[PDB]
Coordinates of C-alpha atoms in Angstrom, one line a residue:
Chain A
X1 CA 94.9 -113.0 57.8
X2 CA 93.7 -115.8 55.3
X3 CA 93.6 -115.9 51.6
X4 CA 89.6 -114.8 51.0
X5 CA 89.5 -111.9 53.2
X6 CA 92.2 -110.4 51.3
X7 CA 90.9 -111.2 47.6
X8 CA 88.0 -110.1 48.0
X9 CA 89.4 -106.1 48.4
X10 CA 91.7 -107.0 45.7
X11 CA 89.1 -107.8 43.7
X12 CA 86.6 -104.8 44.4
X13 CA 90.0 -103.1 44.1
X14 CA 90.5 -104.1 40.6
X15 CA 86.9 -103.4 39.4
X16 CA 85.7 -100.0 38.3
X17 CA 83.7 -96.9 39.5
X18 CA 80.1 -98.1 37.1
X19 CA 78.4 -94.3 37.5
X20 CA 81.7 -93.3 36.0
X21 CA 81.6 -95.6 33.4
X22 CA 77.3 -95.3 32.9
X23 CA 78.4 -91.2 32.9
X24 CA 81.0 -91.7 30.4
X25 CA 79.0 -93.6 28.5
X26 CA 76.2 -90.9 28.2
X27 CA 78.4 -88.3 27.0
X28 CA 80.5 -90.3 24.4
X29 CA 76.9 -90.9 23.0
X30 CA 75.8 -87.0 23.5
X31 CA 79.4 -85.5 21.5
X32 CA 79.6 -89.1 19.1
X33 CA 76.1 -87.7 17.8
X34 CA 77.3 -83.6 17.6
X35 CA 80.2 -84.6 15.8
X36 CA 78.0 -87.0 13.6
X37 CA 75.8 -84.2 12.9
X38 CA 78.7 -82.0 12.4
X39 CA 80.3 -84.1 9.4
X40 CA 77.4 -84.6 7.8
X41 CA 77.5 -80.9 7.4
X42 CA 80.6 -80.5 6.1
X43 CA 80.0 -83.4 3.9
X44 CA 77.2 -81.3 2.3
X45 CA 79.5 -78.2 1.0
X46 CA 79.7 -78.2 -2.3
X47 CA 83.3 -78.5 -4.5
X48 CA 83.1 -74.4 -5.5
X49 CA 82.2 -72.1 -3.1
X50 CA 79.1 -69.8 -3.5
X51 CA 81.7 -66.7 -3.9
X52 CA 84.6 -68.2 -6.1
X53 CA 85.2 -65.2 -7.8
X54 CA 84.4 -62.8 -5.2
X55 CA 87.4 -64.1 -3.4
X56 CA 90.4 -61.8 -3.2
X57 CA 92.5 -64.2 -4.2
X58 CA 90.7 -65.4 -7.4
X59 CA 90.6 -61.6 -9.4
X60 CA 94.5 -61.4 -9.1
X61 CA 94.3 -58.3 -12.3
X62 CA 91.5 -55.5 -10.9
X63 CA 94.3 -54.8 -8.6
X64 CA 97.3 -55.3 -11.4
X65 CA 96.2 -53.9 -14.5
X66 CA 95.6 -50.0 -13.4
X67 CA 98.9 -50.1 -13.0
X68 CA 99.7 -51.3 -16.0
X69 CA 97.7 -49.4 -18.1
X70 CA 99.8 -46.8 -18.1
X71 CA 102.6 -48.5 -20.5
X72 CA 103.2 -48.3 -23.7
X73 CA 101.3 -50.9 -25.7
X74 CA 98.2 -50.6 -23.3
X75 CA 97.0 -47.3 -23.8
X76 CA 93.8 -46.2 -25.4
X77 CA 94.8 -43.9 -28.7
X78 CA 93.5 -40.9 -27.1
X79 CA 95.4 -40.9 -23.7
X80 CA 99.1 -39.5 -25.4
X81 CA 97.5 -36.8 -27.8
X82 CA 95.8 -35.0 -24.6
X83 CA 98.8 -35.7 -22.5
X84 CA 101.1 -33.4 -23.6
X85 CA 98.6 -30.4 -21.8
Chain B
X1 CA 91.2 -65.4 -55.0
X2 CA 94.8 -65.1 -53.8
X3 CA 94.0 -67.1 -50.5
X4 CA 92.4 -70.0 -52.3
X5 CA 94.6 -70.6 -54.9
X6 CA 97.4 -71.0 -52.1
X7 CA 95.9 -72.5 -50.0
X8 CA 94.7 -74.6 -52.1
X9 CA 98.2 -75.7 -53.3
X10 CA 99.1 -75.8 -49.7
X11 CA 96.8 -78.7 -49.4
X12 CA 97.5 -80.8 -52.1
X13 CA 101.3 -80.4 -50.8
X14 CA 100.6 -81.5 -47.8
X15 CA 98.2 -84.6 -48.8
X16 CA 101.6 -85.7 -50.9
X17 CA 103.8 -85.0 -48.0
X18 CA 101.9 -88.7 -46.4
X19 CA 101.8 -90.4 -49.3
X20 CA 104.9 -90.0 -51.1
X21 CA 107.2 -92.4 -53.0
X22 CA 110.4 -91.8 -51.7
X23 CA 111.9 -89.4 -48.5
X24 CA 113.3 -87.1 -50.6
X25 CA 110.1 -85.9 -52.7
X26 CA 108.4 -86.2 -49.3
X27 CA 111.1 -83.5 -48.2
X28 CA 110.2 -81.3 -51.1
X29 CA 106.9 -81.1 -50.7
X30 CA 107.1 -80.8 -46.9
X31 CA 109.8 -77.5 -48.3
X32 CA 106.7 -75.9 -50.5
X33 CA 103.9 -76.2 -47.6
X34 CA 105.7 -74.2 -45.3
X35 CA 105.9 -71.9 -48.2
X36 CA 102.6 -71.6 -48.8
X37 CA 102.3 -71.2 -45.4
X38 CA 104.5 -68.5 -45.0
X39 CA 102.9 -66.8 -48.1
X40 CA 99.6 -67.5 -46.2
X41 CA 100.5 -65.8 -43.2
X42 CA 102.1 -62.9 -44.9
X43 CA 98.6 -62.5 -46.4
X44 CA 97.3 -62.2 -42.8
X45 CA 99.2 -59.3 -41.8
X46 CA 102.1 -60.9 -40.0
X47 CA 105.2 -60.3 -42.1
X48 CA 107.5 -61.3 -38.7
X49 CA 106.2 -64.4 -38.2
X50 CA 106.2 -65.0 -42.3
X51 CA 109.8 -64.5 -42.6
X52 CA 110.6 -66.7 -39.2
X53 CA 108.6 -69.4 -41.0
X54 CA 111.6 -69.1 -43.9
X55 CA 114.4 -69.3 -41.3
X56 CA 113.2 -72.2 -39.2
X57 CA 111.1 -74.7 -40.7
X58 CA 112.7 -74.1 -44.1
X59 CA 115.6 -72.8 -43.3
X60 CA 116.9 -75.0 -40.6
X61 CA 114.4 -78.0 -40.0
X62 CA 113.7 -78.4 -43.8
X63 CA 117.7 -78.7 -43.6
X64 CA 118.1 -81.1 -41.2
X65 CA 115.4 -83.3 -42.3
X66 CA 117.0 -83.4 -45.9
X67 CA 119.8 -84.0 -44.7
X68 CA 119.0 -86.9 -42.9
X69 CA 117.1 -88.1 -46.2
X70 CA 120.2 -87.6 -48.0
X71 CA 122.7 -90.5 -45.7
X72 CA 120.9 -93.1 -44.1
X73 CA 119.7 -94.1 -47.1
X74 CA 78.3 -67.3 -38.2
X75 CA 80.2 -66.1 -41.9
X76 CA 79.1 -62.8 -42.9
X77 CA 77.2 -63.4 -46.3
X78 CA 79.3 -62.5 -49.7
X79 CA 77.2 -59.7 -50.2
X80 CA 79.2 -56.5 -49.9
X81 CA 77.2 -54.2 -52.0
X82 CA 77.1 -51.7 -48.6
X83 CA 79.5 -52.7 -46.6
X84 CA 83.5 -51.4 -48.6
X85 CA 81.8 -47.8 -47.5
X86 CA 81.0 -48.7 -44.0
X87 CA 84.5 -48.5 -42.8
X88 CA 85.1 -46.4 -40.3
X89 CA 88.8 -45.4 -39.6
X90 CA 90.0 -44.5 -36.4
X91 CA 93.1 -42.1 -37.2
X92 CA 94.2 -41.3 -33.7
X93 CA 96.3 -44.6 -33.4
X94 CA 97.9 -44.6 -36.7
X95 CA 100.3 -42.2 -35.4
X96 CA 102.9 -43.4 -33.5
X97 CA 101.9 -47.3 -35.1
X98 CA 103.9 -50.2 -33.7
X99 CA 104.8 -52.6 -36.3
X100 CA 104.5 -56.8 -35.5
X101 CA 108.1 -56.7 -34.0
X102 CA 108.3 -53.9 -31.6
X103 CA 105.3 -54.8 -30.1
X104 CA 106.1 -58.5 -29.9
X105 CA 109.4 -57.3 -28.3
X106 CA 107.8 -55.3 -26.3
X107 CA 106.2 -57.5 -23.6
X108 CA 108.1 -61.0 -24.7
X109 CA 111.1 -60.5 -22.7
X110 CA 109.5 -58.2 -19.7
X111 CA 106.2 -59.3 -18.7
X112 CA 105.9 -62.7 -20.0
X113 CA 109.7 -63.7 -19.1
X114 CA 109.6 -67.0 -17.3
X115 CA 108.1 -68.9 -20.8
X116 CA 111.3 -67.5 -22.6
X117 CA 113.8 -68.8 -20.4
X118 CA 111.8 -72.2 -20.1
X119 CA 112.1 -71.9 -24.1
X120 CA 115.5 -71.7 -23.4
X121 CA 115.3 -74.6 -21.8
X122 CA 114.0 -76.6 -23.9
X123 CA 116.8 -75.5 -26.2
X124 CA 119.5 -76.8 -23.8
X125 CA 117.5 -79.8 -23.5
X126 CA 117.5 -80.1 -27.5
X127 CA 121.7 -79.6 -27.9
X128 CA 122.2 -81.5 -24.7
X129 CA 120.1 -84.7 -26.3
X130 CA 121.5 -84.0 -29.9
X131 CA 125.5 -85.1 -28.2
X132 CA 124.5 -87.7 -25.7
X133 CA 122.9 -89.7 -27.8
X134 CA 124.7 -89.4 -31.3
X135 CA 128.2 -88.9 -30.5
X136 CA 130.3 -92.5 -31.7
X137 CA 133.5 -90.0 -32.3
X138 CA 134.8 -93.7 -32.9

């Protein structure tokens, strides 16, 4: 053929679907604004935890010391005088 | 009336330890605070860590700083009237009584392990520094 009739579907060609791009538009807004909302979330927890202490990891010695308190230098004075019966 | 006196002339050793005339009297006086010292804690109950005051400071650093001197050249109110006949004693504990040693020994090299061997440590580093740095052998 000629040079227009060819350039012309190369061009349309080259361009885009726009509902795709108007559709992918609308949801990069829609998840932009969760996730948005979703930082400024976590942004809000405070440095210590409500628990702290509760955690399992933070007692480390209600678990330990009954254990221990059976060795010498941890006993109270009247746990050997009634041991022996 | 015993604690005041020595501590007392634990203090007035120690303010002429800073402002001495020459190293050597400053050595001396630095010799009778750890004395009083000592003394001090023997008063406290802690005849262990009394005598270890004697064989370190003054018996080894004391040493070693002289002879680096030597070359290179709320209170409770004092009202007791009814209180010396408010002790109560609890016997069962006496017997069987660990002195400041045995218990000290007890849990130092068992439970609490890991600070002796970094004491240790430090030790190593002290001799190892001691050599590198001083050693002319010229």
């Amino acid at each position: 053929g000629f040079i227009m009739e060819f350039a012309e579907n190369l061009v349309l060609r080259l361009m885009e679907n726009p509902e795709e791009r108007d559709r992918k538009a609308r949801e990069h807004i829609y998840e932009m604004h969760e996730r948005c909302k979703k930082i400024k979330e976590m942004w809000a927890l405070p440095i210590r935890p409500y628990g702290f202490w509760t955690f399992e990891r933070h007692n480390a010695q209600l678990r330990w010391d009954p254990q221990i308190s059976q060795v010498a230098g941890r006993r109270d004075p009247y746990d050997d005088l009634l041991e022996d019966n | 009336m015993i604690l005041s006196v020595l501590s007392s002339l634990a203090l007035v050793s120690g303010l002429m330890v800073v402002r001495a005339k020459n190293p050597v009297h400053s050595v001396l006086f630095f010799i009778l605070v750890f004395c009083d010292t000592s003394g001090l804690l023997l008063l406290l109950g802690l005849d262990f860590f009394a005598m270890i005051f004697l064989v370190v400071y003054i018996g080894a650093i004391a040493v070693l700083f002289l002879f680096v001197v030597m070359m290179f050249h709320i209170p409770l109110l004092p009202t007791q009237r009814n209180t010396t006949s408010l002790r109560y004693t609890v016997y069962a504990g006496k017997v069987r009584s660990w002195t400041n040693l045995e218990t000290l020994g007890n849990l130092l090299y068992t439970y609490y392990f890991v600070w002796f061997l970094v004491s240790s440590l430090i030790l190593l580093v002290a001799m190892i520094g001691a050599i590198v740095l001083t050693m002319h052998r010229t």
